[PDB]
Write a protein that binds this ligand. Structure first.
Ligand SMILES: OC[C@@H]1[C@H](O)[C@H](O)[C@@H](O)c2nnnn21
Ligand SMILES: [Mg+2]
Ligand SMILES: [Mg+2]
Ligand SMILES: [Mg+2]
Ligand code: NA
Ligand code: NA
Ligand code: NA
Ligand code: NA
Lengths: 1011, 211, 170
């Protein structure tokens, strides 16, 4: 039998799924959640050997260790050890699409372990092995005898080894297949790896044992009273003396306790469950669980004899909370949620898909620090710890079954085929049976992108019947199917409709009100954070606040799926699809995270942080209105910090504690703000600071901010009359202009300021030329490749219109000497196949104060694709250490993604002004900048800018960041205007109309001086 | 599900058919032990899906049934929905777990009396006339099994048909049952006699209860 | 493997269920519902031998007939020929309640049939066998090699025999 090619065999001899066990033999240990002696990790050094196909594995391996086998760490994905290559493919299956068959050349991982088992574990009781995660299927032998088989690589498979083990030394033999019929259900957009990638362990249970237990919590109208219901099930031999006690603890305080013999109520004509019992406990004024206040209790289930002797104990953390949909809204404890969510794949750049405690806590912290309150287990049940941490730290979780069949044509071919229903069910049911007691799980999910099929309907109903405590959602087949309690579209836009046939992505605001639609709307995936992205993120968040039934979404996604490679020297770099010899692959589509693989923030994160703020602000004259968006908590660790600064110079600053009830308001009266004499804009900057450390943040953590423009004094005083007069040197080739030790040279054949001197020293390495293009962002490229041209992507419009080729033709270059200045007038025209794309009409005025006032007027042909930018560039000779600007920052910000940035005096090292996206693109821009300082140079105006050691051309032509080489000098881009960055998705043009450069006639002015 | 020709014959002679999945677990304690067990979902589903996949084209099939006397379990709920999703042209019924659960479009009790209530704990048989108008109830009532025709019986048959006729939402039932399940045995003279439970050495048995 | 004691295995290599087929190669025949050459009944006389459990079936029975075997009509219930006693029971299962296991002593019926298959049925096309009902589970062999397994004694189990049959005698 080839069980891995039969979706009717998903397992053999596998034990039933159940919630987490430890079989404690001391209730105190159970209560306090201390380690259990009855639970042993088999983690550590294992013996591993790779084979090209299961047929190639020697018979001898069952009986004894292979001399050819290495010693490796388990858990691990074996492609992280180098045995074969990890494949990165998005939609297209990494195997031939031929259900239920897999390739005969099926990489086979042979794991074995020689290990000791103590005598006492075999004299009495049941000993089982637990494989938390095996990708994708496996057979298992113990001491040569065959035990069982298993599938579903994201949930634990367990087997009873009691009869196979002997005292002292034993040997496990685990045969792991990379591909199986199960693979067809596991087509998530991630890396395709394999092996024993999650813990292994041994659990000793008594013969008479707790086999299962459910926790439930119901509430009266106001949540001032609750009933905790505990259904307990047992295996073994029923006795009249057997008892079950459930006790509920809060810290060291016994809150409630109940005891009953086995014997459930009559459920039908044949009686009831004699191997079950349900405990009901009253709890008065329970402390309720939420992401805001993750209040927990502890439940201990003790299986014991009448006379008091404990047989075994099981426990779990209990969070008192109700989740329900009512009148179109998702309520947690009767209050309508706003899901500041993010999707999170299980990813590590060194270990692969192997999860460890440290990184999880690192993710959770970082998330909570950036105003996230919900996470989605895209697209499978996670490592069991993850649920415990979300219980404890406080994040709402969507627990998703490990079913995705994206590559099927059409998408539901399997999920509408009744022969696949059993394999699908076990992926849903065994998740539910596992995670149902974790309070952080508030929503169940039937999987990812498998369209909509009868099987989804069956299974949706199955959960509703089995666990009505939680809503079920599912996006497949149009996001609003009969299989979903929630309209959960992916990448639906705020205002724009996208009526795809059969499965349209409506504007979220419009989707709500479609005839007869009543359900809430929470995007399961939105704001595609690929490279320089998250543009127009603020639009979603405005909509979420105005629309009750729009209750948030989950950003895609948390972390770049970039793996670590090494060069010749041993130096490490970040690799994406293709970099392992994987083909077909999908390049950098695996990197879509708000953070880098190492958990460094992308610039987008701060934008998320700002939009997801729990405090809203309004300004009326000098009254600040602080509005809380918390549902349950009082603002008991929050003070408001305000300052008013004139073009960067702090005038008045202040501090007021916040005392805002949830959903409440607080008015703060700013003291008389003493009006300054000199010219400039006044700015108000409030920030919310948390005086005290919490479990998820340090003291002084900033949780929210906002700015307002106050009064403005416009400059009316004339610059001190220029004592001197600049000198023209008309040549046939050059216009040279001299003042003191400053010299400006204009080339007459090209028309651009070609060189500049301070003393004898050259300032420029390439002349000051107009620029109309940028190094395309992942959003500009979309799905376009060299051999898969999508002519609709912004980049492909630009290429075909000649934007990148077009050379400037000079139309007019004249010079005039004035009363106190030298006036240069230029005009240019960029043409391609005799089509004129742009016209640039400039006037340089160099007065006797040594200042050069540039005036640029650009015409853009209405019938050409709107350009990335309208600006000037040049390569500076100088390489300085610090960049100092007055404008939006400190971080990278773009016109459609600058809400998080503040206007101030910013001073950063040069390296900070470059964002190291793994796929290089235009990056580092700062907008609404009025003053830029670089060494001797200053530029004044109202422009956008970036500043780095890399040319747009280098950026364009280099595929990976690590191959970029610092160029001689400093490249400077100064844009009067720059195009939005898009991001609603990364496969079709996503820059909103208001952020495209379509005016046709643009104007910007610059004052370039050396102060 | 029946011999395949049976459906051809009802199609052509004109009889309304109820097609029932091959699922019955009467013996279990409680009756829904397997049908509430997810590890039993697979086996059950094939018994339903394959029925629909074979018989969905016969005009005589007007109602699908999920089986018989198997309590009420989440598997029934899952499958009921399955049918509704694949074939919306036919109502779905199932008696188990009280005759009016969330897995049935039709209140289909077995041996519910016309006037007399039988208020068994958990799974009561109400009088059909009272059953209809219980708070919140709106479905039609058609007995899946009534008027046990065991031996000298069918007393009180007129009461049902008078009730059916008076009450619009009392739309009838199915008598139990058509034919005595007696088998032929022979004595010492090769003379044929009708036999029932226990007459073959079979034990334990339910004697005449097959006829 | 003891598939009859495992509810996760209800069939092996069984073909997808579907409505009544006849594979007519003539529109009119299909329209008037006439008998079809592509649908052959195999009902009639078979070779049958009873056993008290499967472990008691001699391995030779796959390869060639059993001399002890009788000739009986198919379809039938073997209880009606006298090989064991039919059991009448209402609620109480006829077997011990211990799911998914059955009794080790499991009355096993061995059915065999030698039959012709025409040249034209194997040169091209697909040749399946259809068992409209088999109570309660069965394994199938053809010309000695194993084909598959099927459960549910009230719906037809179907198997693709194309690659098992040989021209003439099978
Ligand atoms: O980042 C690529 C994303 C990601 O794979 C999502 O799971 C899916 O909704 C999708 N469809 N098209 N692109 N994507
Ligand atoms: Mg399989
Ligand atoms: Mg996908
Ligand atoms: Mg079986
Ligand atoms: Na809202
Ligand atoms: Na992706
Ligand atoms: Na009526
Ligand atoms: Na009977």
């Amino acid at each position: 039998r080839r069980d891995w090619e039969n979706p009717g065999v998903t397992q053999l001899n596998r034990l039933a799924a159940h919630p987490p066990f430890a079989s404690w033999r001391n209730s105190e240990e159970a209560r306090t959640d201390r380690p259990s002696q009855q639970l042993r990790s088999l983690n550590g050094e294992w013996r591993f050997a790779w084979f090209p196909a299961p047929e190639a594995v020697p018979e001898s391996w069952l009986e004894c260790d292979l001399p050819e086998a290495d010693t490796v760490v388990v858990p691990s994905n074996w492609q992280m050890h180098g045995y074969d290559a990890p494949i990165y493919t998005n939609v297209t299956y990494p195997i031939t699409v031929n259900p239920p068959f897999v390739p005969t050349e099926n990489p086979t991982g042979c794991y074995s372990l020689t290990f000791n088992v103590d005598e006492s574990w075999l004299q009495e009781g049941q000993t089982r092995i637990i494989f938390d995660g095996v990708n994708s299927a496996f057979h298992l032998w113990c001491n040569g005898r065959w035990v069982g088989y298993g599938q579903d690589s994201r949930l634990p498979s367990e087997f009873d080894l009691s009869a196979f083990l002997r005292a002292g030394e034993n040997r496990l033999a685990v045969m792991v297949l990379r591909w199986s019929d199960g693979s067809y259900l596991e087509d998530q957009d991630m890396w395709r790896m394999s092996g024993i990638f999650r813990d292994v362990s041994l659990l000793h249970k008594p013969t008479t044992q707790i086999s299962d237990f459910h926790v439930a919590t119901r509430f009266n109208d106001d949540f001032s009273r609750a009933v905790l219901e505990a259904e307990v099930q047992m295996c073994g031999e029923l006795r009249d003396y057997l008892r079950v006690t459930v006790s509920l603890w809060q810290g060291e305080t016994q809150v409630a306790s109940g005891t009953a013999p086995f014997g459930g109520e009559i459920i039908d004509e044949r009686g009831g469950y004699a191997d079950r019992v349900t405990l009901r406990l009253n709890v008065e004024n329970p402390k309720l669980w939420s992401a805001e206040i993750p209040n927990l209790y502890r439940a201990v289930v003790e299986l014991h004899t009448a006379d008091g002797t404990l047989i075994e104990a099981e426990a779990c953390d209990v969070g008192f909370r109700e989740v329900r949909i009512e009148n179109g809204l998702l309520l947690l404890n009767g209050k309508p949620l706003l899901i500041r969510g993010v999707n999170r794949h299980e990813h590590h750049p060194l270990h692969g898909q192997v999860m460890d405690e440290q990184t999880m806590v690192q993710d959770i912290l970082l998330m909570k620090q950036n105003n996230f309150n919900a996470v989605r287990c895209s697209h499978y049940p996670n490592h069991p710890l993850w649920y415990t941490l979300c219980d404890r730290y406080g994040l709402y979780v969507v627990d998703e079954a490990n079913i995705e069949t994206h590559g099927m044509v059409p998408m539901n071919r399997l999920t509408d085929d009744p022969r696949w229903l059993p394999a699908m069910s076990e992926r849903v049911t065994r998740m539910v049976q596992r995670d149902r007691n974790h309070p952080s799980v508030i929503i169940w999910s039937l999987g990812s992108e498998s369209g909509h099929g009868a099987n989804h309907d069956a299974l949706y109903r199955w959960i509703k019947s089995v666990d009505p405590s939680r809503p079920v959602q599912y996006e497949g087949g149009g996001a609003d199917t009969t299989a979903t309690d929630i309209i959960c579209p992916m990448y639906a836009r705020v205002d724009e409709d996208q009526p795809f046939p059969a499965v349209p992505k409506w504007s979220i605001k419009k989707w709500l009100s479609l005839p007869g639609e009543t359900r809430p709307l929470i995007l399961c995936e939105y704001a595609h954070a690929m490279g320089n992205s998250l543009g127009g993120f603020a639009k979603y968040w405005q909509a979420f606040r105005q629309y009750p039934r729009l209750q948030g979404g989950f950003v895609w996604d948390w972390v770049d799926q970039s793996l670590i490679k090494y060069d010749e020297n041993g130096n490490p770099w970040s690799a994406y699809g293709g970099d392992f010899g994987d083909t077909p692959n999908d390049r950098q589509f695996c990197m879509n995270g708000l953070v880098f693989a190492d958990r460094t923030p992308h610039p987008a994160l701060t934008e998320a942080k700002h939009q997801q703020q729990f405090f809203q602000f309004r300004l009326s004259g000098q009254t600040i209105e602080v509005t809380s968006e918390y549902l349950f908590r009082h603002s008991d660790n929050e003070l408001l910090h305000w300052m008013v600064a004139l073009d960067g110079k702090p005038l008045a600053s202040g501090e007021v504690p916040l005392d805002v009830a949830p959903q409440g308001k607080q008015l703060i009266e700013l003291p008389e703000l003493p009006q300054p004499e000199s010219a400039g804009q006044l700015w108000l900057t409030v920030r919310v600071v948390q005086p005290n450390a919490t479990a998820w943040s340090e003291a002084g953590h900033i949780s929210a901010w906002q700015q307002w423009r106050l009064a403005e004094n416009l400059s009316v005083t004339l610059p001190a009359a220029s004592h001197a007069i600049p000198h023209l040197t008309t040549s046939e080739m050059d216009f040279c202009i001299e003042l003191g030790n400053k010299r400006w040279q204009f080339n007459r054949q090209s028309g651009f300021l070609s060189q500049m001197w301070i003393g004898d020293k050259k300032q420029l390495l390439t002349p000051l030329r107009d620029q109309f293009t940028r190094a395309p962002l992942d959003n500009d490229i979309g799905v376009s490749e060299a051999t898969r041209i999508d002519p609709n992507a912004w980049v492909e419009r630009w290429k075909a219109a000649g934007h990148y080729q077009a050379e400037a033709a000079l139309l007019q270059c004249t010079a005039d000497t004035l009363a106190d200045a030298v006036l240069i007038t230029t005009a240019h025209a960029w043409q391609h196949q005799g089509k004129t794309l742009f016209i640039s009409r400039k006037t340089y005025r160099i007065d006797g104060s040594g200042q050069m006032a540039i005036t640029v007027d650009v015409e853009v042909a209405s019938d050409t694709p709107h350009p990335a930018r309208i600006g000037l560039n040049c390569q500076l000779a100088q390489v300085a250490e610090r960049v100092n600007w007055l404008g939006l920052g400190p971080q990278e910000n773009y016109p459609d993604r600058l809400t998080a940035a503040c206007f101030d005096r910013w001073d950063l090292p040069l390296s900070d002004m470059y964002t190291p996206y793994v796929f290089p693109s235009e990056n580092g821009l700062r907008c609404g900048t009025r003053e830029l300082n670089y060494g001797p140079h200053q530029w004044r105006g109202d422009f956008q800018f970036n500043i780095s050691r890399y040319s747009q051309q280098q950026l364009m032509e280099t595929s990976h960041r690590h191959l970029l080489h610092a160029e001689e000098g400093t490249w400077l881009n100064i844009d009067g205007f720059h195009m939005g960055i898009g991001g609603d998705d990364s496969w079709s043009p996503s820059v909103s109309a208001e952020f495209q450069l379509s005016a046709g006639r643009y104007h910007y002015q610059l004052v370039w001086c050396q102060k």
